[PDB]
Design a binder for this molecule. Structure first.
Ligand code: HEM
Ligand code: HEM
Ligand code: HEM
Ligand code: HEM
Lengths: 146, 141, 141, 146
């Protein structure tokens, strides 16, 4: 993954404005709502019976915050996503056996969430830089499969 | 399979687009070209730069096809049949690409309709665009 | 969309399976488990080793569903509706996985029916399994 | 991609029996027949109007032979598929803009062809080793996208 300086600038500027207590939970919740087979991995997370139940579920919010934390770490190490995501790759691939297509899906849901929250500020070139980032993270998280 | 709630949700969100329909269609295409550059090679006769009259005009056509699908959501295979033949037989559009445009359409809607883009409506819109895509990729032979 | 030729091709190839139907279904599952190990986690109550009575029994069920689809190829959404609910609502099978089993079913047919697995029939079978998969993944909510 | 010694053995033994003048063309032809959007990239290849025309097309056979040649090279360098496929990656990604999903599809068509030709000898463990190989090649060929 290769962001140009203008794309790194676009990415880091927007990210500074992100609420790290909320956005990750919003993405994970939306993943569970939009792509319901993903709920297969979150049996122990409690009530996921309605969209409101999912979005309000404190465990969804907590783990969403952990996901966003890993994205934040990825942003700090764009040139070594593979090492950054090594243990998470062992977890999601070797332990959980999550199909790696879902890493791409969560990346895109995160993109939709950023668009929703930032509106016109989430311009087409800003989106393009973020797509490079979420593809980079998905690919790194899938390394144990490759 | 679109539920009654999905149909209501899509019609409602689409309802709020109004005069902006073609504009948002053009924006979705621009987002797709910038984010997923492989898709550019389908349009060698278009200048794809920002503000392109050709992309603006095409955006309106894409929007119109989507509103056709909304308006005839229970009979989409029939409504989109001609468009399906075009994209498969003539244009040979790789089926992966429909997922890319569908995503960029969702992103465009989220960036313009914050009150409407709830998680439930997000799911409804995604199912709808997946259904449209399924029809548009049903005619490879 | 399955053409008349596709329907004929699938019925004909499937025709040659005969008593071997369940066996080939079990073989396809075994190929899927070995080649795509993520799919194993859907069957924690099965022993998946070679010669497994549980995999043999399940193979017969999978084969039966496929013959149901062949026999009612023009009404597949209805014929597979119950199976569709099961795989989406109860089992939560990731849609990517249908492509994996479909591929392993093609590989099993190619390994057993060399005269029948022409390029045309290969295409017909692939479209048919994709149609079956489309139905089995149509009920996520 | 990590083949065990038993899987390398399975792979190399079968490969020794492959007709390198025919199998690649059979795979490429079948790709064009089974997944017809792929014909988009082969406009200059002449008559592709029927399955017989495709399979008998001398250019399809010739380029199929080049594809198989690249697989043979990949088999010789399983521990460096990325370097092995670097120039082909520039070609298929940067020049041709082929979506990388099609590399996975051609890999699987090749698998079906090997099953067709070898029958019962193409056992489920032999298939599993070949899936590791065709995933490895697809991933390497897509490196310029990653
Ligand atoms: C960009 C994609 C993803 C990222 C960055 C990510 C990140 C994380 C992080 C940081 C954790 C906490 C790990 C820990 O406790 O040390 C986690 C746990 C978990 N993730 Fe993800 N995740 C991603 C995608 C997914 C997807 C798509 C699924 C399933 C559909 C999934 C399923 C899980 C589960 C089940 C856990 C709990 C693991 C356990 O504690 O046993 N993840 N993930
Ligand atoms: C929601 C999905 C899509 C919709 C609703 C849609 C709609 C349309 C419409 C309405 C037209 C004009 C048809 C006519 O003039 O009769 C068109 C043309 C075209 N579409 Fe799409 N399309 C979709 C997806 C795609 C994708 C994913 C691609 C390629 C990446 C694509 C490539 C093209 C091309 C190359 C043309 C011809 C434009 C020209 O040469 O003037 N379409 N599409
Ligand atoms: C062509 C595609 C498929 C067909 C025709 C098919 C067919 C079937 C049938 C007929 C049953 C038994 C249903 C019953 O007892 O009422 C079944 C059960 C089941 N299927 Fe599938 N299936 C397909 C794809 C898949 C895939 C891709 C997966 C996961 C990788 C899967 C996982 C399961 C599981 C976990 C069960 C429950 C078995 C048990 O717990 O006893 N299926 N399927
Ligand atoms: C495993 C996947 C693939 C391999 C190993 C492969 C290998 C090759 C090789 C060795 C060549 C000859 C390059 C040369 O002349 O130096 C070639 C050319 C070409 N390939 Fe592929 N290929 C693969 C997949 C595909 C796919 C899926 C497509 C399109 C659907 C494609 C489109 C082309 C085209 C259009 C050329 C001609 C390039 C030119 O001369 O301008 N390839 N490929």
């Amino acid at each position: 993954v290769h962001l140009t300086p203008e794309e790194k600038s676009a990415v880091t500027a927007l990210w500074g404005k992100v609420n790290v207590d909320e956005v990750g939970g919003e993405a994970l919740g939306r993943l569970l709502v939009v792509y319901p087979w993903t709920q297969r991995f979150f049996e122990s997370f409690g009530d996921l019976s309605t969209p409101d139940a999912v979005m309000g579920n404190p465990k969804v919010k907590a783990w969403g915050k952990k996901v966003l934390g890993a994205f934040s770490d990825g942003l700090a190490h764009l040139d070594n996503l593979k090492g950054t995501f090594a243990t998470l790759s062992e977890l999601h691939c070797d332990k959980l056996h999550v199909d790696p297509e879902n890493f791409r899906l969560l990346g895109n849901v995160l993109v939709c969430v950023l668009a929703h929250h930032f509106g016109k500020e989430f311009t087409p070139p800003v989106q393009a830089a973020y797509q490079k980032v979420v593809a980079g993270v998905a690919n790194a998280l899938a390394h144990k499969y490759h | 399979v679109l539920s009654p709630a999905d149909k209501t949700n899509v019609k409602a969100a689409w309802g709020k687009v109004g005069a902006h329909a073609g504009e948002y269609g053009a924006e979705a295409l621009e987002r797709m070209f910038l984010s997923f550059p492989t898709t550019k090679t389908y349009f060698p006769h278009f200048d794809l730069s920002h503000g392109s009259a050709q992309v603006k005009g095409h955006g309106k056509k894409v929007a119109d096809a989507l509103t056709n699908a909304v308006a005839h959501v229970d009979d989409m295979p029939n409504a989109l049949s001609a468009l399906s033949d075009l994209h498969a037989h003539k244009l040979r559009v790789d089926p992966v690409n429909f997922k890319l445009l569908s995503h960029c359409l969702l992103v465009t809607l989220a960036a313009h309709l914050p009150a409407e883009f709830t998680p439930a409506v997000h799911a409804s819109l995604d199912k709808f665009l997946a259904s449209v895509s399924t029809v548009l990729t049903s005619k490879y032979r």
